[PDB]
Amino acid sequence: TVFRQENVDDYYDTGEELGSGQFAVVKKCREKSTGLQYAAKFIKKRRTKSSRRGVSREDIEREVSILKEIQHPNVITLHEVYENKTDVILILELVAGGELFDFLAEKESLTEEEATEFLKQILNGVYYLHSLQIAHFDLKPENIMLLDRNVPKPRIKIIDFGLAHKIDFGNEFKNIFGTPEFVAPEIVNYEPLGLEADMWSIGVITYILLSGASPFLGDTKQETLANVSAVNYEFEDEYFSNTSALAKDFIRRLLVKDPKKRMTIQDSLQHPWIKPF
Numbered sequence: 001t002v003f004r005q006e007n008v009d010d011y012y013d014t015g016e017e018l019g020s021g022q023f024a025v026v027k028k029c030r031e032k033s034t035g036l037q038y039a040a041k042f043i044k045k046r047r048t049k050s051s052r053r054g055v056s057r058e059d060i061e062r063e064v065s066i067l068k069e070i071q072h073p074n075v076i077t078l079h080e081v082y083e084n085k086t087d088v089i090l091i092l093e094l095v096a097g098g099e100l101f102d103f104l105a106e107k108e109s110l111t112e113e114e115a116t117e118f119l120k121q122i123l124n125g126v127y128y129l130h131s132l133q134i135a136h137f138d139l140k141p142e143n144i145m146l147l148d149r150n151v152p153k154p155r156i157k158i159i160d161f162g163l164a165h166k167i168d169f170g171n172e173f174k175n176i177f178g179t180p181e182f183v184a185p186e187i188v189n190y191e192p193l194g195l196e197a198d199m200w201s202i203g204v205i206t207y208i209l210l211s212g213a214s215p216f217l218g219d220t221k222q223e224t225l226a227n228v229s230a231v232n233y234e235f236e237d238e239y240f241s242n243t244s245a246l247a248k249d250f251i252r253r254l255l256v257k258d259p260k261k262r263m264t265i266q267d268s269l270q271h272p273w274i275k276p277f
């Protein structure tokens with residue numbers, strides 16, 4: 001699919017830099033015709049077929065195609081898409097409340113109530129995606145944005161669909177790999193992947209939300225991946241002594257090596273703790 005090739009600077013005024021990635025930079029922008037604000041994601045294109053730098057057309061188109069299909073309170077939406085010789089520019093919905101990561105960094109640890117307020121929105125966002133057979137594959141604090149972090153119960157939206165994939169055959173087998181701390185055992189072992197991988201990530205996120213600690217984090221990447229594959233983690237009393245046994249149960253049913261035994265998004269929503277290189 002070809003995108004709008006006019007100069008994006010003729011329709012938008014960019015400003016502050018919101019975020020950055022290995023092959024992408026996000027900037028706040030304002031559309032001239034409406035005065036409305038957005039997050040412009042510039043993705044670097046590959047210059048040759050056999051290049052490591054930049055993102056292949058196939059991958060950029062996959063992210064765009066998945067972004068054009070979604071419309072939900074807890075997920076980011078795509079406004080327009082421009083491109084030129086070096087980059088493809090995704091004009092996305094702005095989320096100016098900052099990353100859950102920076103939020104958590106500033107608060108250390110939350111209460112089960114605060115945690116569940118965030119968790120329920122994330123689950124709702126993931127329920128929507130899984131319903132469309134969309135696997136995010138990169139769920140983590142850094143890919144969860146708040147709309148306004150100066151509120152007692154901040155609303156969130158999931159972002160970064162750079163690794164998202166459609167799962168129409170129950171499983172995908174293509175070496176999809178994200179951040180070691182949050183990837184499930186099947187990703188670490190390069191086994192077929194499906195919607196289940198997102199549920200494992202939710203578990204890690206949940207563990208983090210309640211304790212401020214990472215469950216499998218090791219001093220190096222290989223160690224972390226090793227801990228993940230062996231499901232090497234425990235609920236440290238120093239961190240969880242005042243955490244309810246129900247919250248641990250919820251985490252425990254997500255951090256399961258076997259994908260077919262892991263809780264599904266529907267299960268997690270009906271769980272007693274949630275249910276109202």
Ligand SMILES: Nc1ncnc2c1ncn2[C@@H]1O[C@H](COP(=O)(O)OP(=O)(O)NP(=O)(O)O)[C@@H](O)[C@H]1O
Nearest residue numbers: 018019020021022023024026039093094095160162
């Ligand atoms: N819609 C948005 N609104 C506000 N900030 C955003 C938005 N999308 C992304 N960001 C910020 O920009 C950062 C990078 O965006 P992201 O889409 O995650 O790219 P990436 O996948 O890291 N890129 P790359 O490394 O090139 O593949 C995020 O982690 C956020 O801080």
Ligand SMILES: [Mg+2]
Nearest residue numbers: 021142143160
């Ligand atoms: Mg990212």
